[PDB]
């Protein structure tokens, strides 16, 4: 996965590959890069 700013996508048990950015200071669900 090629992230926008380079921020991490992780598999949570909820069944979501989440995107969180320390530059964004926020937790977003789906790939922002799409």
């Amino acid at each position: 996965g090629p992230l926008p700013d380079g921020w991490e996508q992780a598999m949570t048990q909820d069944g979501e590959i989440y995107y969180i950015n320390h530059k964004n200071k926020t937790t977003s669900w789906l790939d922002p890069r799409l």
Binding site: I20, H22, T26, T27
Partner: peptide
């Protein structure tokens, strides 16, 4: 819905 809070990132 809300995902996990603003957090440093998880792998397992």
């Amino acid at each position: 819905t809300p995902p996990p809070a603003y957090l440093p990132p998880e792998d397992p």
